[PDB]
Scaffold this motif. Structure first.
Motif, short mmCIF file in Angstrom:
data_model
loop_
_atom_site.label_atom_id
_atom_site.label_comp_id
_atom_site.label_asym_id
_atom_site.label_seq_id
_atom_site.Cartn_x
_atom_site.Cartn_y
_atom_site.Cartn_z
N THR A 100 3.35 1.08 -0.87
CA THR A 100 3.39 0.46 -2.22
C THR A 100 2.69 -0.89 -2.27
OG1 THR A 100 5.35 1.64 -3.05
CG2 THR A 100 5.02 -0.59 -3.89
N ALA A 101 2.96 -1.74 -1.28
CA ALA A 101 2.33 -3.05 -1.22
C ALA A 101 0.81 -2.96 -1.09
CB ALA A 101 2.92 -3.89 -0.10
N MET A 102 0.32 -1.90 -0.46
CA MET A 102 -1.13 -1.73 -0.31
C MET A 102 -1.83 -1.56 -1.65
SD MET A 102 -1.79 0.36 3.14
CE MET A 102 -0.76 0.14 4.60
N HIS A 103 -1.17 -0.89 -2.59
CA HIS A 103 -1.70 -0.74 -3.94
C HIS A 103 -1.93 -2.10 -4.62
CE1 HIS A 103 -1.31 3.73 -4.73
NE2 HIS A 103 -0.78 3.59 -3.53
N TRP A 104 -1.17 -3.11 -4.19
CA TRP A 104 -1.25 -4.48 -4.71
C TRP A 104 -2.30 -5.35 -4.03
CZ3 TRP A 104 4.63 -5.84 -3.70
CH2 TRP A 104 5.43 -4.90 -4.35
N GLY A 105 -2.91 -4.87 -2.95
CA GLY A 105 -3.78 -5.69 -2.12
C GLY A 105 -3.01 -6.80 -1.43
N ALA A 106 -1.76 -6.52 -1.07
CA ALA A 106 -0.98 -7.43 -0.27
C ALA A 106 -1.55 -7.49 1.14
CB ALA A 106 0.47 -6.99 -0.24
N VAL A 107 -1.25 -8.58 1.83
CA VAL A 107 -1.54 -8.75 3.24
C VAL A 107 -0.26 -8.44 3.98
CG1 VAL A 107 -2.23 -10.48 4.98
CG2 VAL A 107 -3.23 -10.46 2.67
N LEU A 108 -0.22 -7.32 4.71
CA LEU A 108 1.02 -6.83 5.28
C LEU A 108 1.27 -7.52 6.61
CD1 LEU A 108 0.76 -3.08 4.38
CD2 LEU A 108 1.22 -5.01 2.95
N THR A 109 2.46 -8.12 6.76
CA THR A 109 2.79 -8.89 7.96
C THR A 109 4.02 -8.35 8.69
OG1 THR A 109 4.15 -10.54 6.81
CG2 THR A 109 1.77 -11.00 7.08
N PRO A 110 3.95 -7.11 9.18
CA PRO A 110 5.12 -6.58 9.89
C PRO A 110 5.30 -7.31 11.24
CG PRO A 110 3.29 -5.13 10.24
CD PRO A 110 2.83 -6.16 9.20
N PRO A 111 6.52 -7.32 11.79
CA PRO A 111 6.78 -8.06 13.03
C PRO A 111 6.14 -7.51 14.30
CG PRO A 111 8.73 -6.86 12.38
CD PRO A 111 7.74 -6.69 11.27
N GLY A 112 5.88 -6.21 14.36
CA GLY A 112 5.50 -5.60 15.63
C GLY A 112 6.51 -5.99 16.71
#
Lengths: 202, 202, 202, 201
Positions: free
Chosen positions: C138-150
């Motif tokens: 969903t956030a990708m549709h917004w052009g968000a910068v995804l910051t998962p913890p890994g």
């Protein structure tokens, strides 16, 4: 009259998947299926395998297990894939086997077979669910009928509750009775559903 | 002897899903099923609805379509869900209906039902796959038997080759013939698998 | 020298997401961010809420927590979403919120904000990973910068190891330290990344 | 220094190669130091030998260096491109991914930007799911994912994949709308990476 033809195709480096796949194979035998237990061909170079005693040891442990071929899936009525998780997907070894199935796929000879999947990771939430997801998504391209376990038994709950398929947290230690029971329920259920579909069409 | 019981549960704001679900319903009747065509309860605010007259109009267009309820899925042997995409997932409306199925789910009363899905998007690659994926993952928690189309008929290739499920690019124009044929194939296939399943289980 | 603006938007029925979101909010403050802790509007009918003590109790416990609106995301430079899993997706309540973001999305005003996600389920492997995945998609549709913890801390390991985002097994009893340290690191890291991106922009 | 950009791509029959060259040129135009890198071919030669376009593309790519783990260590921005195989990435791409275990466990993949591209013969035949599998992988590294979203009109014009560029492989040259979407994706990723590095200096 003829028993359900069940193919369990697993990749294992260090033995968790091999233990899991044997449990699956026995479950299928117990439930009335004719079973082929089949290892995914190893691709790693020997000098890499040599850096890990447990990897080299498991390769030896599985030496009399036959390697999976496309013919095995053409034969099968019910299919189970098991791969360890590699960054939330299946191993390259498993994917290389899948990538040999194009001819069969082109022939329509993968359609209508039942499919489920299993996995293992070193972390409880370490990408297992996504590993299962990616294997199921692949099966959909084949027109397979997907038979995930869901929560159709008390055992699923008892073993960490993965409705997408059996997933085992790998820590060197032997399989827990709850994981073994989760595998058994998954496979028995798939065999039962496959027998029903096959009877309905013949 | 008794027809396959097919429930086609769809959300539609402006009519795309309504058209798709009608096509599914025809395909199921033609395939010999008893069919319930059922709309997902509109949960949006009337101020939000009142800014889109096509949405208001389509609500009225569907006035004699009954609202889907858990009872309908309990009844069903074969289920089709259809939702347009919202950012690559299903509509909140569709998820609200899903979220009322907890009681059936607790009772083991969604298991062994067949399931496929359909979707639409204003973009061809704007979630026509991910939306179906999220709906399939939900059905796995039920222990449903997933019957996606794969590439099991030529019409799938003609309509964009979506193996996961029918997906339509929503543009306000009438359903393309190739999309219609892909819907019909999917539903027909699922009815036939369901019938075989039920036949072999008694 | 503006503090990073961090919005924690969470849905919680029975209090687990609220405990997680409070931990997130404190970690954000400790990292020098300006924090909003924001609850997702409850859509459940009162007679459904009335069926469960922990649900009624949690609603009251959250009374003073502001309800999330789209303008909170317009304000935020860094966003965290938390939802319990429902059949491997987010709750309808969270999706209902997401579905209010169309105008903001249309305006281009969601682009370039950092995004990570958190979840919970009753089972360790009960759809958490897929719930997080659906939220990131969903956030990708917004052009968000995804910051998962890994695995950027060794307290991911200790929490159960969730690279996609913190995920807790809901048991009613309080949160474990490992889960709490997982959340803290995820948020601290996201704030640090966000501050760098903003400083780089000017 | 310029943003270090690594374009790692698998291609059998040249579609991925064309996409990756467009991406590499976009990175240069945007001021990045660029490595265009092919994924090692793992298919048996007798399989490759069955298809002229596959044999020809391997020869066309002969002077493209093979990707190694150290290229990702070097890189500050990464783009992975694979055609679909049943809705997932190629075994060749996964095989490269599997060699990243050493860098992963040392934490040497964290904080790099990541986006992905793909292709399929069918427009809805895994053009979203293949991207998604590659993004999930990158999450395990603590990568910072920078998909294009709908952040330029060109995304809508090329089919509106917010997850990443995806091309319908028909054997013909790359459509212009596809080229533009690749360019936007890479340009955007370079820009974000430059800001991130500048802000952390």
């Amino acid at each position: 009259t003829a028993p359900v033809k069940l193919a369990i195709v697993f990749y294992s480096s260090t033995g968790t998947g091999y233990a899991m796949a044997q449990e699956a194979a026995e479950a299928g035998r117990a439930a009335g299926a004719e079973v082929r237990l089949l290892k995914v061909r190893e691709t790693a170079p020997q000098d890499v395998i040599d850096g890990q005693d447990a990897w080299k040891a498991n390769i030896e442990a599985m030496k009399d297990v036959p390697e999976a071929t496309p013919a095995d899936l053409e034969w099968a009525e019910a299919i189970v894939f098991s791969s360890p998780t590699r960054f939330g997907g299946a191993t390259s070894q498993m994917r290389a086997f899948i990538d040999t199935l194009g001819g069969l796929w082109s022939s329509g000879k993968l359609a209508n077979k039942t499919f489920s999947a299993m996995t293992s990771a070193q972390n409880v939430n370490g990408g297992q669910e996504t590993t299962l997801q990616t294997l199921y998504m692949t099966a959909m391209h084949w027109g397979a009928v997907l038979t995930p376990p869901g929560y159709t038994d008390e055992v699923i709950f008892k073993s960490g509750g993965n409705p997408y398929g059996a997933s085992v947290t790998a820590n060197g230690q032997p399989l827990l009775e709850n994981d073994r029971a989760s595998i058994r329920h998954q496979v028995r259920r798939q065999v039962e559903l496959t027998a029903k579909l096959l009877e309905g069409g013949s």
